[PDB]
Amino acid sequence: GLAVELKQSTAQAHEKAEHSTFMSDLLKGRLGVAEFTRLQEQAWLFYTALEQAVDAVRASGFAESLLDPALNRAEVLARDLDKLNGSSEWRSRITASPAVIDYVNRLEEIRDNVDGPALVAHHYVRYLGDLSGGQVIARMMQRHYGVDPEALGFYHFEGIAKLKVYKDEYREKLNNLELSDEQREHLLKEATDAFVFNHQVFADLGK
Numbered sequence: 001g002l003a004v005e006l007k008q009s010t011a012q013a014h015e016k017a018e019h020s021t022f023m024s025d026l027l028k029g030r031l032g033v034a035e036f037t038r039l040q041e042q043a044w045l046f047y048t049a050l051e052q053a054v055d056a057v058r059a060s061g062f063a064e065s066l067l068d069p070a071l072n073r074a075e076v077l078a079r080d081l082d083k084l085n086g087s088s089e090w091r092s093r094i095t096a097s098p099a100v101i102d103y104v105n106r107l108e109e110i111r112d113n114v115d116g117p118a119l120v121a122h123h124y125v126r127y128l129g130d131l132s133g134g135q136v137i138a139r140m141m142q143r144h145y146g147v148d149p150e151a152l153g154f155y156h157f158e159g160i161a162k163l164k165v166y167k168d169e170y171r172e173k174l175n176n177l178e179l180s181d182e183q184r185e186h187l188l189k190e191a192t193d194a195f196v197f198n199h200q201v202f203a204d205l206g207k
């Protein structure tokens with residue numbers, strides 16, 4: 001099944017992502033609200049691009065049931081940033097890091113080429129992450145740094161009642177997605193690329 005193969009093919013990349021110095025220090029309480037805010041600013045950039053690609057692919061008629069609009073984060077994230085930054089000034093202030101430029105470039109290639117299988121790979125890596133370790137991240141931003149949960153809306157999925165149930169549903173959708181042999185190979189390859197982009201985002205954030 002695709003869901004298992006995806007999890008296995010990306011296991012090494014997941015571990016490397018999880019143990020990046022920036023993410024490691026952030027989660028262990030060794031940084032601060034400021035760094036979490038820098039992370040969320042960069043995320044707003046790549047989620048904006050991700051969700052444009054999602055919009056394109058869904059509109060094209062591919063992976064429709066997987067591409068649940070309830071997952072959209074860009075507007076929720078903008079409200080978090082308004083809270084974290086104390087105004088909407090950040091919008092005209094933020095600059096993409098070199099890793100984010102590469103990530104956004106890939107996502108815009110996917111969008112404009114309407115590369116459905118690639119988009120699914122990117123969707124899995126980000127959204128299943130948010131529904132998973134993202135829950136731990138939100139808890140630890142509050143506990144380590146006193147971030148108000150009003151500024152952690154990113155990690156809350158309105159009108160998803162049960163996260164584990166949702167993820168099992170998601171994995172079943174992956175398993176039933178019709179793919180040619182090369183589309184499947186491409187999806188798997190792109191999933192590891194997606195993890196590597198995130199690794200590079202964290203590396204730039206650590207400096």
Ligand SMILES: OC[C@H]1O[C@@](CO)(O[C@H]2O[C@H](CO)[C@@H](O)[C@H](O)[C@H]2O)[C@@H](O)[C@@H]1O
Binds near residue numbers: 007011012014015
């Ligand atoms: O579980 C998430 C993800 O982590 C991986 C590799 O990083 O597995 C590691 O962590 C698991 C628990 O979270 C352990 O059971 C496993 O032994 C360890 O390698 C991936 O396999 C997994 O999808």
